[PDB]
Design a protein that fits this description.
Helix Hairpins; Nucleotidyltransferase, domain 5; ATP binding (chains A, B); glucokinase activity (chains A, B); six-stranded mixed sheet; transferase (chains A, B); Hexokinase, domain 1; EC 2.7.1.1 (chains A, B); homodimer; alpha/beta; 484 residues; five-stranded mixed sheet; glycolysis (chains A, B)
Chain lengths: 484, 484
């Protein structure tokens, strides 16, 4: 039924019937949005320079935050470990049992946050989280445990960490707004509530989810060299080496030696806030000028899936205003910012039909705009250009990390809604890496540097980081700066 | 982010905290909805007898419609062929180029039927279709063709045919209401409008989409023994042999002799309308009594995904009425027929949490029903029972056809939204087949009889049936009853 179950072939996409004047505008969209291999190589050179800068004492626009994971997982770890992921709408609690052969078992619950928890008191939040952990532990360990359960806490909010078992909140995001937490260490706040309920849990690590994605994926897949999130937000994490981190000079204890690995949470959404290398167009400038924080998050704005529909909307409105398309149409819906979400370029790029009838139905039904076939061919071209630009720019971050560290091969453990669901994304990213490196290789599965699906970072990853951490803490091996 | 990109593992599903009274009701639900292996074998034996009955002179509840495809595609077929797929809302035109090594290329367009066609004249309909085909051919063959393109027409309406290149409309369905067409052969009606527009197409075949799924999938995959649809509706098609078709004795020319293959479109939705073997519960009886055609489509009612939410709804109301669940709830939204669509059992079976928070959020948000976790554990067990019974009954159709024809091994080419999207469906079906056959086999990938994703029946299949038919029409080999 319908088009059958297997992915339809890509449409042929003939441009033979497109009139000269529209075809000139299509070429102008190609000039605006195509990222050449040379431009990619150029962006990567500057990205490497900014990765270096963020690790220097002076710092830079890329935070390059030390994650205080100073060893790799081996895959041979065993035991029971907890993970907590505090999101905007819910708390997830995960019991991970590590099998010792790159394998694990999970048992997980999800506790939806009451509306008021995001904005009430500090004690109310940590008490709620402790009540969920008590309910969980009491069910899964009805007769307690002989050793407390180490817990890793995924707390993906701007924070500073001078050691892994700490997180001083810098600023709340994602709808949280709780007094008396900004500027304080959240780890003892949660531990205090745990102890109040006499729950046998020791909070031993606080992480960013992308650090988790890196370490979970390297536990199951030892070829992992990076964890990357390609969604509404963007981020990457990898292992540097202590000697490469000027900003830690003089602060490390001697048992964290110069050749020690150090996981880094790049927070590279802010790469090129100086607007010197990314190929921002007039439409990107408008998106930025109209955003909550103009001049911030330059790289996120150029690569996040959240803006891809918005770019199309502004281009389309421009084409309309300049007299090229939708001449007789009521275009009022195209004047609403963010009316086109990521589903628009997605559906348009998935349209299997030469006459682009999925695109026709989307425009008529959702935007009240009737179109000619040749207009839809422009619209389809535009969607392909915007989806492909975002993949080629994301891969500059992958390439900069690999080139910085000398990784000639890598699995890049990827997650987020763009990687997982945007049409053709994996193909677009693989072609981008092939174009950067000029590999002579037929099949994407054989690419020396290739994206693969990540393991669960904020659950499994935080639990494995808790396992690694607990082994250091037990032995007296340092997990932070001297004295901390 | 979230649970990461990989399928979460199945929840543990502890029943330890479920009170004795609720566990007794769960056991009662397992009695009502479990289909044993011996039951499935009992059903298969009767289903074979009913397949044989539908092919006999006296007929039976299973139509067993000869589809007038009297040869197997070899995979060596080459050429350009058209398919037309006419639904209730859309027309699809497919140009299929066969490559001669079980491979094909497609080029396809989709045209939404104007609202006024459904109630227009016969001429308006065929004219519209011909104008779509003129448009399409004018583009993909701007200088014409050396021989007319043979076209296979998937005509998704009750119709009878005494030869492949004919279809006499029985009754319009899908709120079509066009005069002068019921009781008439639609092929010449379409051909006339084609010729009026001087389009180089010859309509050579009219088919049911499931016959197309069988044929297209056999062209690409030589182990295909059946085409099966498991969606809102259900159907199967497979090749029988003319000697097994008593109702065609006396009607066939010598060049469709007793040893000839004959594709059958079973339309086995009506299996067991006489209610002799399917394990109908009181809930299935209610569904039938309240359905548009009580006493019809018994097997479809017991296997289609459309009913699975509704079976759950009535079970849950009956448990509320008996005082077991939702005791202090306002259950008024649960009293609406078909309020629970296939997404309810699907989301419930996909819930990865031990506390079943997806199911909590589904019931609280969509039905205004608050639940205890032990209620949700009963709800999850009910969803699993209902999804599992539908898969096990579906595979009784597969096994009947395979045992009828002596297929010890087979690929069963499957499509439809239940096969394609219902959680765990493929594993349920594969376990059902292993249970019927008592195979000693560890991996589902290795099962002797297995479901595999089908090729596109209503497009590609209709074009390949057009190719096989044209070969016979050109040579003067028959494709129907003597003299038709």
């Amino acid at each position: 039924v319908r088009l059958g179950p297997k992915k339809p072939p890509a449409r042929k996409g003939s441009m033979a019937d497109v009139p000269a004047n529209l075809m000139e505008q299509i070429h102008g969209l190609e000039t605006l949005f195509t990222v050449s291999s040379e431009k990619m190589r150029s962006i990567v050179k500057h990205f490497i320079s900014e990765l270096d800068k963020g690790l220097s004492k002076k710092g830079g626009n890329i935070p390059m935050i030390p994650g205080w994971v100073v060893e790799y997982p081996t895959g041979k770890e065993t035991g029971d470990f907890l993970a907590l992921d505090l999101g905007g709408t819910n708390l997830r609690v995960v019991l991970v049992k590590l099998g010792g052969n790159h394998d694990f078992d999970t048992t997980q619950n999800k506790y939806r946050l009451p509306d008021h928890l995001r904005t009430g008191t500090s004690e109310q939040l940590w008490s709620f989280i402790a009540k969920c952990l008590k309910e969980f532990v009491d069910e899964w360990y009805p007769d307690g445990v002989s050793e407390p359960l180490p817990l890793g806490f995924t707390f993906s909010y701007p924070a500073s960490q001078k050691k892994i078992n700490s997180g001083v909140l810098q600023r709340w995001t994602k709808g949280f707004d709780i007094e008396g937490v900004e500027g304080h260490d959240v780890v003892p706040m949660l531990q205090e509530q745990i102890e109040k309920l006499n729950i046998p849990i020791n909070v031993v690590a606080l992480i960013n989810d992308t650090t988790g994605t890196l370490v979970a994926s390297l536990y199951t897949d030892p070829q992992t060299k990076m964890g990357i999130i390609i969604g509404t937000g963007v981020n990457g994490a990898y292992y540097d080496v202590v000697s490469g981190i000027e900003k830690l000079e003089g602060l490390l204890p001697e048992d964290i030696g110069p050749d020690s690995p150090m996981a880094i949470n790049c927070e590279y959404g802010s790469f090129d806030n100086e607007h010197l290398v990314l190929p921002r167009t007039k439409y990107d400038v408008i998106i930025d000028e109209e955003s909550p924080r103009p001049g911030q998050q330059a790289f996120e704005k150029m690569t996040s899936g959240y803006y891809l529909g918005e770019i199309m909307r502004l281009v389309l409105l421009d084409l309309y205003d300049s007299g090229f398309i939708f001449k007789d149409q009521d275009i009022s819906k195209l004047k609403e910012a963010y009316v086109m979400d990521t589903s628009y370029p997605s559906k348009i790029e998935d349209d299997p039909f030469e006459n682009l009838e999925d695109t026709d139905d989307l425009f008529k039904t959702n935007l009240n705009i009737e179109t000619t076939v040749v207009e839809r061919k422009l619209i389809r071209k535009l969607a392909e250009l915007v989806g492909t630009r975002a993949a080629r720019l994301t891969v500059c971050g992958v390439s900069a990390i690999c080139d910085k560290r000398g990784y000639k091969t890598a699995h890049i453990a990827a997650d987020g809604s763009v990687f997982n669901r945007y049409p053709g994304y994996k193909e677009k990213a693989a072609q981008a890496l092939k174009d950067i490196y000029n590999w002579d290789v037929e099949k994407m599965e054989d690419h020396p540097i290739q994206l693969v699906a990540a393991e669960d970072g904020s659950g499994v990853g935080a639990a494995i980081i808790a396992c690694l951490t607990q082994k250091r803490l037990a032995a007296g091996k340092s997990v932070g700066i001297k004295g901390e």
